[PDB]
Design an enzyme around this catalytic site. Structure first.
Site, PDB file in Angstrom:
ATOM      1  N   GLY A 158       0.719  -1.122  -0.099  1.00 18.20           N
ATOM      2  CA  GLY A 158       0.000  -0.178   0.429  1.00 18.20           C
ATOM      3  C   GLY A 158       1.054   1.795   0.130  1.00 18.20           C
ATOM      4  CG  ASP A 162      -6.257   7.942  11.075  1.00 21.62           C
ATOM      5  OD1 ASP A 162      -7.831   8.494  10.340  1.00 21.62           O
ATOM      6  OD2 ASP A 162      -5.210   7.389  10.267  1.00 21.62           O
TER       7      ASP A 162
HETATM    8  O1  LIG Z   1       1.217   1.535  10.103  1.00 26.67           O
HETATM    9  C1  LIG Z   1       1.215   0.977  10.447  1.00 26.67           C
HETATM   10  O2  LIG Z   1       0.690   0.497  11.347  1.00 26.67           O
HETATM   11  C2  LIG Z   1       0.571  -0.513   9.565  1.00 26.67           C
HETATM   12  C3  LIG Z   1       0.916  -1.886  10.302  1.00 26.67           C
HETATM   13  C4  LIG Z   1       0.763  -3.307   9.822  1.00 26.67           C
HETATM   14  C5  LIG Z   1       0.414  -3.655   8.410  1.00 26.67           C
HETATM   15  C6  LIG Z   1       0.124  -2.424   7.914  1.00 26.67           C
HETATM   16  C7  LIG Z   1       0.864  -0.979   8.650  1.00 26.67           C
HETATM   17  N1  LIG Z   1      -0.056  -2.348   6.706  1.00 26.67           N
HETATM   18  C8  LIG Z   1      -0.757  -3.698   5.763  1.00 26.67           C
HETATM   19  N2  LIG Z   1      -0.924  -3.547   4.913  1.00 26.67           N
HETATM   20  C9  LIG Z   1      -1.271  -2.153   3.885  1.00 26.67           C
HETATM   21  C10 LIG Z   1      -2.797  -2.395   4.283  1.00 26.67           C
HETATM   22  C11 LIG Z   1      -3.335  -2.693   5.138  1.00 26.67           C
HETATM   23  C12 LIG Z   1      -4.644  -2.521   5.244  1.00 26.67           C
HETATM   24  C13 LIG Z   1      -5.732  -1.541   3.875  1.00 26.67           C
HETATM   25  C14 LIG Z   1      -4.835  -1.447   2.427  1.00 26.67           C
HETATM   26  C15 LIG Z   1      -3.318  -1.774   2.747  1.00 26.67           C
HETATM   27  C16 LIG Z   1      -0.061  -4.312   6.379  1.00 26.67           C
HETATM   28  N3  LIG Z   1      -0.255  -5.345   5.676  1.00 26.67           N
HETATM   29  C17 LIG Z   1      -0.007  -7.173   6.061  1.00 26.67           C
HETATM   30  N4  LIG Z   1       0.350  -7.533   8.012  1.00 26.67           N
HETATM   31  C18 LIG Z   1       0.368  -5.564   8.927  1.00 26.67           C
HETATM   32  C19 LIG Z   1       0.242  -5.124   7.644  1.00 26.67           C
END
Ligand SMILES: O=C(O)c1ccc2c(c1)nc(NCc1ccccc1)c1ncncc12
EC number: 2.7.11.1
Length: 326
Positions: A44, A151
Site C-alpha cells: 500500500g 484515526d
Molecule cells: O502502519 C501500520 O501500523 C501498519 C502495520 C501493519 C501493517 C500495515 C500498516 N499495513 C499493511 N498493509 C497495507 C494495507 C492495510 C490495509 C488495507 C490496505 C493496505 C499490512 N499488511 C500486512 N500485515 C501488516 C500490515
C-alpha cells in the site's frame, strides 16, 4: 474563552507514570540492521508512508516494512514510543524492529487482511458484533495506557477472517492524553472526525475514538460507507446535523462556550434529530436490531463527555452473545 474538559476515565494515567513513558521527545531510538529484511512487494501507499511485504533473512519470518516519508522526527519518536508502550496489548499491532537505509522504516508483524470493500458486504450480524468487541478491547486498552488513536476507520482495522483475528494499525496520529492539554483538531479522516474537531474544540480526549467507532458501526449495519459523507469539514458537520439534529449541536456549543466559525452560521440551519429507522432497508435489515440502534445512539453524541467509554460499550446488550461464547 472555551470551557475546560477532562476525560471521565483514565484521566490521570500518564501523570502517575514515569516522565519517559509519555515524554517521547527524549526517547532515544536504536536502529537495527536494514540488511536483515528484503522487500518482496508493495502492499500500500499513503501520504506519510509506504508499506511493503518483506522477508526476514535471519529466521525466514514474513514481515511488513513501513518506510516513513519525511515527517518531523518528533512524530516518529511519538509513533515508536506509543507502539512500544502498547506492544503485547489485545489486538494491537506488534512493532518488531526499526531500521533505515537514510530514510526510517518500521517493521511490523505480518497479518492476512481481507479487503474491507469485499468483506463488509459479507459480514453477518454476529461477525459485526464480534469484531466490534475486538476493536473495543484495543480501544479500552490504549485508553487505559493513556493513549488516543485519533484515526479509527475501516482501513486501520485489519481483519484475518479465516482466523477470526483483528489488529488495530497505524498509530502515526496517536497521542498521549493529558488533562488540560489542547490538541490539534486537524486529525482523523474526514468522515470519522468527531464534532469536537469540526467545531474546533481542542481539549478533547479518548472519547474522540468512540465517535469514530460509531461512524464505523453505522456504515456496517446500515451498509453505507461512509455514513456521514461530507464534501468538506464544514459540510461534514451539516451531514451530522441532518441526522443528530441541530438542537443538541447548539446545546453543545453553549455548554462549552465554543466560538463557532461564522461560516457555519449560514449553512447549518435548523434540522430535527432523525430516528434510525430512516436508514433501514431490505438490504441492511438483517444487521439492524433494537440493541444495535441503542448501542449506536450512545456512541454518536455531540457532547464527548456523554459518549460511552470502551468498557461501558463492551458491557452493552449488543455483545451479550459474544461475551457468552468466550
Ligand atoms: O502502519 C501500520 O501500523 C501498519 C502495520 C501493519 C501493517 C500495515 C500498516 N499495513 C499493511 N498493509 C497495507 C494495507 C492495510 C490495509 C488495507 C490496505 C493496505 C499490512 N499488511 C500486512 N500485515 C501488516 C500490515
Amino acid at each position: 474563552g472555551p470551557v475546560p474538559s477532562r476525560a471521565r476515565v483514565y484521566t490521570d494515567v500518564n501523570t502517575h507514570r514515569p516522565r519517559e513513558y509519555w515524554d517521547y521527545e527524549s526517547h532515544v531510538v536504536e536502529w537495527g540492521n536494514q540488511d536483515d529484511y528484503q522487500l518482496v512487494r508493495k502492499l500500500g501507499r499513503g501520504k506519510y508512508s509506504e508499506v511493503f511485504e518483506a522477508i526476514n533473512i535471519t529466521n525466514n519470518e514474513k514481515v511488513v516494512v513501513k518506510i516513513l516519508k519525511p515527517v518531523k522526527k518528533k512524530k516518529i519518536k511519538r509513533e515508536i514510543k506509543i507502539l512500544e508502550n502498547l506492544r503485547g496489548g489485545p489486538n494491537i499491532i506488534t512493532l518488531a524492529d526499526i531500521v533505515k537505509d537514510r530514510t526510517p522504516a518500521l517493521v511490523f508483524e505480518h497479518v492476512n487482511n481481507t479487503d474491507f470493500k469485499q468483506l463488509y458486504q459479507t459480514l453477518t450480524d454476529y461477525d459485526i458484533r464480534f469484531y466490534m468487541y475486538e476493536i473495543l478491547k484495543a480501544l479500552d486498552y490504549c485508553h487505559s495506557m493513556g493513549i488516543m488513536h485519533r484515526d479509527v476507520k475501516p482501513h486501520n482495522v485489519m481483519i484475518d477472517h479465516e482466523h477470526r483475528k483483528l489488529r488495530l494499525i497505524d498509530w502515526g496520529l496517536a497521542e498521549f492524553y493529558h488533562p488540560g492539554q489542547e490538541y490539534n483538531v486537524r486529525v482523523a479522516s474526514r468522515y470519522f472526525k468527531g464534532p469536537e474537531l469540526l467545531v474546533d474544540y481542542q481539549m478533547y480526549d479518548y472519547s474522540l475514538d468512540m465517535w469514530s467507532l460509531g461512524c464505523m458501526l453505522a456504515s456496517m449495519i446500515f451498509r453505507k460507507e461512509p455514513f456521514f459523507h461530507g464534501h468538506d469539514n464544514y459540510d461534514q458537520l451539516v451531514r451530522i446535523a441532518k441526522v443528530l439534529g441541530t438542537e443538541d449541536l447548539y446545546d453543545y456549543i453553549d455548554k462549552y462556550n465554543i466560538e463557532l466559525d461564522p461560516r457555519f452560521n449560514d449553512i447549518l440551519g435548523r434540522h430535527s434529530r432523525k430516528r434510525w429507522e430512516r436508514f433501514v432497508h431490505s438490504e441492511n435489515q438483517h444487521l439492524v436490531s433494537p440493541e444495535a440502534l441503542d448501542f449506536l445512539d450512545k456512541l454518536l453524541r455531540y457532547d464527548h463527555q456523554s459518549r460511552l467509554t470502551a468498557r461501558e460499550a463492551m458491557e452493552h446488550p449488543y455483545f451479550y452473545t459474544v461475551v457468552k461464547d468466550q
